[PDB]
Design a protein around this ligand. Structure first.
Ligand SMILES: Cc1cc2nc3c(=O)[nH]c(=O)nc-3n(C[C@H](O)[C@H](O)[C@H](O)COP(=O)(O)OP(=O)(O)OC[C@H]3O[C@@H](n4cnc5c(N)ncnc54)[C@H](O)[C@@H]3O)c2cc1C
Ligand SMILES: NC(=S)Nc1ccc(F)cc1
Lengths: 1199, 112, 56, 56
């Protein structure tokens, strides 16, 4: 039995002094980074004067010398230019020239462009950036289709031919040096004869499967032979070289997979380097995301020390000056060069992933960014690092990659007058940098060599990541700006930074991750699992957590209670005892409710701000205790380290969010319900546990906390922390055990509300028990039930397969598919289904399944043997029906726990899936594009509606699908899991829940007797059918009811449309819609009129109980209203409903509540009032519960 | 400028639909498109496909896309003013078909 | 000013849209009122003309 | 505003204007009345009935 966490994340090698100084700088404050960079980049007055003169001469030359001419010649609008280029691209996909020319003359130029040619506009975002200099994540394909029709009808074949010629020159000659290495090598002869050199980029990156990595490997190998043959012994300085990306060579290139990286990726780079050695060409390792920097150093160290590579100085390595570690990375590389005796080629760049680094750090709640946030800081860093490199030209070969004429001039003068080929060089990109460096290379200019980075690839590969390859801060954009003087362009960034009030101050408009929510609340903090110091510290904290004697006891107000005690086992390894639980007797559960009722007034009397302070103090304790809590969650619940971090962060976020919502809303008039039973699941055993409890507690209610039988230990620790934060023992009682405990709590007479997250079947049993009871005030007992979903993702032919596969793998198999939001059904447009499926299967087989006390494990166990058998029975039934089933092979070590291998099942129809399968099992169906609307119907027809994903670049598809799908959490161009508190408020409709959304602003209002007005909760929209109904009421003489109807129309928040603060590169939207059809159960005519007003004002239709006998009360309705009204004798035949409004005395309400609980389908949120309450209280019915909350999260970095 | 009902036929004077009424084949005006698809049009197209009226179902989908219903533009003008231009449904369209397929095409055009 | 704007606007809308396939109707009768005796007079006539129709 | 520093507030407008590439250039984001419609077309021009030169 392996000791827990003994092998969590051991580093590749012991960390040297120089490596530790790199790690220490990972997220160092920008105000601490910049002063030493400023000092290192400081040059003499004379040098700065000469540099400004040289930069002025270069920028003047540049300004005194394509698509814009085409737009001008044909008077094209921006959208027409984009549409034309999209059309040209598609025409160029036609292989044979004469065929293309025939289609243009005989079909396209006649307007019939739709007929012959996936959308034309799939790559419009890229052409948009080409044409307008602006980037969008998605494409307005209806605008582009109109523009294309307009321009063809106006200008005909001549403009099509010109577009085709332009796109052909740009894609085959400007974006790439060549379509193949052979072609690119032929095109390099010209500028090589003028004194340039070349480094060829075969455009591979981010391999998804073993097959992709092998394809990129064999592309690199073939290019190395081609380049080495062309080099013909010119050597590494005068001859051409190659640039490779490590992410192209292995599908799991990451610190978490360091063992596989050293065992599988390293020998591949060595084999390529050996071939480059044999031809004596350069081989450069490109730099990628910040969390791969230090891992790439371990590979560089092995390669440079490998004797088989000796005698060759062609190995190169990129360092990114926008990174805070850059000078310490350079120190390490220069020392490695000295130790190995290899003159490492060091390419200094600024960096290409800035936007993605900002977004990632914000998502992960890290201390700071790993890159600078002001462009001028990157410029100072670059000059500072160039100074370090120029002092070390005897042991490294510096390569100054920049298009910035001021940067160039500063370095040129810094380097001095002694030069020789091989001392250092400049570099630039093909197409972009030649105008500048034609002013540099050659004895008649500055006599410094420049190496051209030459992309190589076809139209498919080029258009992929060309977007990343033009922003307002870019030199290349600013040199083209007529409102930018040369004096602004030759300004010394070193001296500008030195004169700022705070040297190194963060950019004003970028939030640190902890400040993502501003004054509202402090964001939770995560941990950087790529940081070796963090991994070392966490390993020890995790080992310590496994030496703790974790226990859970029935913690009543009077103290701990005795009971039946059993052990809690690691689901990944039943030999690993995590702790022991003492389970609550049915008698003690009932006693706890009576103790909670006795203490309810005392807790309700604590001022809401002090209740919130308890929650805020609990959040601080959880944050401080995060490493220990991780260890418990990993072993008790079978979760991976990353998912445990997210779980602890989610708990902290709930505490702080509901504390802030309380400070925004609650006063003395918002009385508590009373004792609330909180029943939590095993799949989020801290986060959902904490969320329900914190909401009920802060609303002024004492809580009976019943955790899942499988995960009592983290629950007991959560209660301990809440009590330490100030929650009295009488306000928070812990009752571990099985469903007998849950049932006893739910049935207790003093139970005033139930919060349940779990299966729909248990939720329905709770609803039936609660329908027998009424509150002391004669109202139904509130139930907040969050249940499963049959969550789907729709992917069309415009989506990027690699992005789809990563989002699918994560959404379906993260946490072994045991998320309520997990992706259950993937719907692939038929044209791309085979390609995406092949990639998905390849990605599936790269997952590591095992006991989760290892950082390398991607997917852990399912929670129990019963869970495992249930899931595996489903898989075998599908296989028995002849469905194609793909499964990963599991290691023998999994036999000691309960694992289900991640599985892909290909279905014929969405109807083949007739049950929720709560495990790592993805179902795949294919659809024809014209059947999209019917497919959305099929998704909706399941009755579920939790999470939904859509991958498309087409706005028309987004608008259509998101307007037709009925789901509470929508995700566009991203995964569908990990909804963030206050950002994607979480909760579905139909079979997926009652609402209101957890982590949203309606949640606390359900836990008090009088709901407050939530923050930002209002709408200026008035339902027009409500307005027709109020006029009808006035026409009938029902004057008071008409006024109440107008008041309901005003008070309704239907139409609310908010953007919620979150990270950059994402838009998070929160909207209130109609719920659907509300069951009305009136007793009197006035009561019916009030109920109808409430329902119509919130956008709903109604079904009115025909047994009320009130049909004559609605004669001569306007057709608009009549369209919304039906009458129901058989309620269960006319559903599903989305809610119910009931009028009557207590006996009638109870009878109706029980009848509604028997309706099949969704658990209806029921509101009841007496006839007298309808007359007295304008809020007899609450409009919060008659609208539907929708959260939509759109990835706007997706292009 | 121009209204509805007893106020005129349209299209609006000084607007982008005007010239199209004066030619036998109207062009696509500048900026004249919409990403919205009428949902009843979509329901009609599915019904048509259930019937096997494939040509008409295809015609209906194409009408749904080329419709500019839902257009919502801000027009350039002076500071201190916001000038908006939107395309809405007209109301109830009189359909005078001769054939079943003619009726399906007319209904698609009106629903879209 | 309105007459000038009509002229320039219908001119620009023509440059944005009209092609050989957008055939003219033919002779257009333009009947104008006394309350905008130049602006509406001009707007109707300019539109009909620039669309390729002779005007009465 | 905590963003604006005392240096910004103390800058000499006379010398900042003197150093600009075109002294007295119109604000880049404010359209001259003639340019209200950008490259689409030239706005019609009125007459200033408060200007005595114009009235005469
Ligand atoms: C031949 C060559 C090879 C390259 N190889 C790589 C590589 O392997 N890996 C890699 O990551 N990059 C690489 N780059 C660099 C990257 O692709 C961009 O070309 C480069 O950053 C442009 O910088 P500049 O000096 O040309 O232009 P500039 O306009 O001077 O600099 C722009 C750069 O400043 C930075 N920047 C912009 N805004 C901010 C901000 N708010 N805060 C902080 N920094 C900001 C960004 O890094 C941006 O790229 C390479 C560049 C060249 C020429
Ligand atoms: N596993 C649990 S807690 N089941 C439960 C709870 C209440 C009830 F009425 C029925 C079942």
């Amino acid at each position: 039995a392996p000791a827990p966490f003994a092998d969590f994340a051991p580093p590749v090698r012991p960390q040297s002094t120089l490596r530790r100084a790199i790690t220490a700088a990972y997220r160092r404050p920008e105000t601490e980074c910049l002063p030493p960079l400023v000092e290192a980049a400081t040059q003499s007055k004379e040098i700065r004067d000469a540099a400004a003169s040289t930069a002025r001469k270069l920028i003047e030359a540049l300004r005194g010398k394509g698509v814009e001419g085409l737009v001008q010649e044909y008077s094209l609008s921006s959208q027409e230019g984009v549409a034309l280029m999209c059309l040209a691209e598609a025409l160029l996909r036609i292989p044979d020239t004469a065929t293309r020319d025939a289609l243009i003359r005989d079909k396209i130029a006649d307007g019939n462009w739709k007929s012959h040619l996936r959308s034309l506009f799939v790559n419009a975002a890229t052409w948009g950036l080409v044409v307008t200099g602006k980037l969008t994540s998605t494409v307005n394909d209806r605008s582009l289709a109109a523009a294309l029709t307009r321009l063809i009808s106006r200008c005909g074949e001549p403009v099509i031919r010109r577009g085709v010629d332009m796109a052909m020159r740009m894609m085959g000659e400007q974006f790439v040096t060549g379509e193949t290495i052979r072609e690119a090598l032929k095109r390099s002869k010209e500028l090589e004869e003028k004194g340039f050199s070349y480094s060829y980029d075969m455009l591979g990156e981010a391999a998804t499967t073993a097959a992709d990595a092998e394809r990129y490997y064999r592309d690199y190998e073939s290019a190395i032979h081609a380049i080495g043959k062309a080099s013909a012994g010119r050597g590494i300085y005068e001859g051409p070289g190659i640039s490779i990306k490590l992410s192209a060579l292995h599908p799991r290139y990451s610190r978490a997979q360091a063992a596989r990286v050293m065992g599988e990726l390293l020998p591949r780079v060595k084999a390529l380097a050996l071939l480059a050695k044999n031809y004596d060409i350069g081989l450069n390792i490109d730099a990628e995301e910040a969390d791969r920097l230090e891992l790439s150093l371990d590979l560089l160290e092995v390669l440079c020390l490998d004797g088989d590579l000796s005698g060759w100085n062609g190995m190169g390595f990129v360092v990114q000056a926008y990174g805070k570690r850059c000078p310490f990375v350079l120190d390490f590389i220069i020392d490695l060069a000295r130790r190995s005796g290899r003159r490492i080629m060091v390419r200094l760049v600024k960096g290409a992933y800035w936007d993605a680094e900002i977004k990632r750090a914000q998502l992960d709640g890290l201390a700071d960014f790993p890159v600078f946030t002001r462009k001028i800081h990157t410029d100072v860093s670059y000059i500072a690092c160039a100074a370090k490199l120029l002092a070390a030209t005897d042991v490294v070969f510096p390569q100054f990659a920049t298009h910035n004429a001021q940067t160039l001039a500063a370095i040129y003068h810094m380097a001095g007058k002694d030069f020789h080929v091989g001392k250092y060089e400049f570099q630039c990109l093909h197409g972009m940098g030649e105008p500048l460096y034609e002013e540099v290379v050659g004895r008649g200019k500055l006599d410094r060599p420049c190496r051209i980075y030459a992309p190589v690839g076809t139209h498919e590969t080029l258009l992929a990541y060309l977007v990343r390859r033009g922003a307002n801060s870019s030199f290349v954009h600013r040199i083209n700006d007529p409102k930018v003087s040369i004096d602004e362009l030759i300004a010394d960034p070193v001296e500008v930074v030195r004169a700022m009030p705070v040297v190194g101050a963060k950019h004003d408009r970028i939030a640190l991750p902890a400040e993502l929510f501003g004054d509202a609340r402090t964001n939770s903090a995560g941990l950087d699992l790529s940081n070796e110091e963090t991994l070392a510290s966490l390993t020890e904290a995790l080992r310590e957590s496994a030496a703790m004697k974790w226990t859970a006891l029935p913690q009543l107000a009077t103290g701990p209670a005795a009971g039946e005690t059993r052990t809690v086992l690691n689901p990944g390894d039943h030999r690993d005892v995590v702790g022991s639980v003492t389970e609550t007797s049915e008698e003690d559960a009932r006693r706890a409710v009576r103790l909670a009722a006795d203490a309810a007034p005392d807790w309700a009397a604590v001022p809401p701000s002090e209740r919130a302070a308890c929650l805020d103090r609990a959040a601080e304790l959880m944050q401080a205790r995060m490493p220990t809590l991780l260890g418990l969650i990993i072993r008790e619940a079978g979760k991976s380290a990353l998912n445990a971090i997210a779980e602890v962060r989610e708990a902290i976020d709930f505490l702080r969010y509901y504390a802030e919502q309380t400070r925004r809303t609650l006063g003395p008039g918002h009385g508590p319900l009373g004792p609330i039973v909180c029943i939590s699941p095993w799949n989020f055993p801290l986060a959902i546990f904490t969320g329900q409890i914190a909401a009920a507690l802060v609303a002024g209610n004492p809580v009976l906390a019943k955790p899942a039988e499988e995960t009592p230990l983290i629950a007991a620790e959560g209660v301990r922390i809440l009590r330490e934060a100030g929650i009295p023992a009488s306000a928070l009682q812990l009752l571990p055990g099985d469903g007998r405990v849950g049932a006893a709590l739910v049935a207790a007479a003093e139970t005033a509300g139930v919060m349940f997250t779990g299966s729909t079947e248990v939720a329905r049993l709770i609803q039936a028990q609660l329908a027998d009871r009424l509150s002391p005030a004669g109202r139904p007992i509130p139930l907040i039930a969050e249940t499963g979903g049959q969550n789907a993702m729709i992917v069309d032919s415009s989506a990027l397969a690699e992005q789809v596969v990563g989002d699918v793998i994560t959404s379906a198999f993260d946490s072994a598919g045991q998320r309520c939001s997990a992706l259950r059904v993937l719907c692939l447009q038929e044209d791309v289904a085979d390609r995406i499926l092949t990639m998905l299967k390849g990605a599936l087989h790269e997952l590591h399944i095992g006991r989760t006390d290892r950082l390398s494990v991607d997917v852990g166990p399912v929670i129990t043997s019963e869970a495992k058998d249930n899931i595996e029975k489903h898989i075998e039934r599908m296989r028995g029906l002849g469905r194609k089933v793909e499964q990963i092979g599991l290691a023998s070590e999994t036999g000691v726990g309960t694992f289900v291998p991640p599985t892909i099942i290909e279905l014929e129809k969405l109807s083949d899936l007739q049950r929720e399968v709560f495990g790592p099992v993805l179902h795949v169906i294919r659809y024809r594009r014209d059947d999209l609307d019917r497919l959305v119907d099929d998704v909706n027809a399941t009755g579920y509606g939790l999470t939904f994903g859509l991958h498309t670049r087409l706005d028309e598809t987004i608008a259509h699908v998101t307007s037709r799908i009925k789901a509470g959490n929508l995700y566009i161009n991203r995964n569908i899991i990990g909804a963030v508190v206050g950002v994607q408020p979480f909760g579905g409709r139909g079979l997926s829940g009652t609402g209101p959304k957890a982590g949203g602003p309606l949640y606390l209002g359900r836990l008090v007797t009088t709901a407050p007005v939530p923050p930002q909760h209002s709408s200026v929209h008035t339902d027009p059918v409500l307005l027709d109904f109020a006029k009808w009421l006035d026409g009938k003489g029902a004057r008071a009811e008409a006024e109440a109807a107008r008041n309901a129309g005003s008070s309704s928040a239907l139409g609310l449309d908010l953007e919620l603060p979150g990270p950059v590169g994402e838009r998070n939207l929160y909207t209130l819609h109609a719920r659907g059809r509300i069951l009305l159960v009136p007793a009197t005519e006035s009561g019916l009129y009030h109920q109808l007003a409430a329902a119509l004002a919130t956008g709903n239709s109604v079904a009115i109980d025909a047994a009320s006998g009130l049909q004559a009360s609605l004669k001569n309705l306007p057709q608009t209203v009549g369209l919304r009204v039906s009458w129901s004798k058989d309620w269960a035949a006319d559903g599903p409903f989305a809610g119910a409004l009931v009028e009557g005395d207590a006996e009638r309400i109870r009878a109706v509540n029980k009848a509604i609980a028997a309706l099949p389908g969704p658990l209806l949120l029921v509101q009841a009032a007496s006839s007298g309450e309808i007359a007295r209280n304008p809020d007899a019915y609450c409009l919060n519960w008659l609208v539907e909350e929708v959260s939509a999260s759109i990835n706007t970095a997706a292009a």
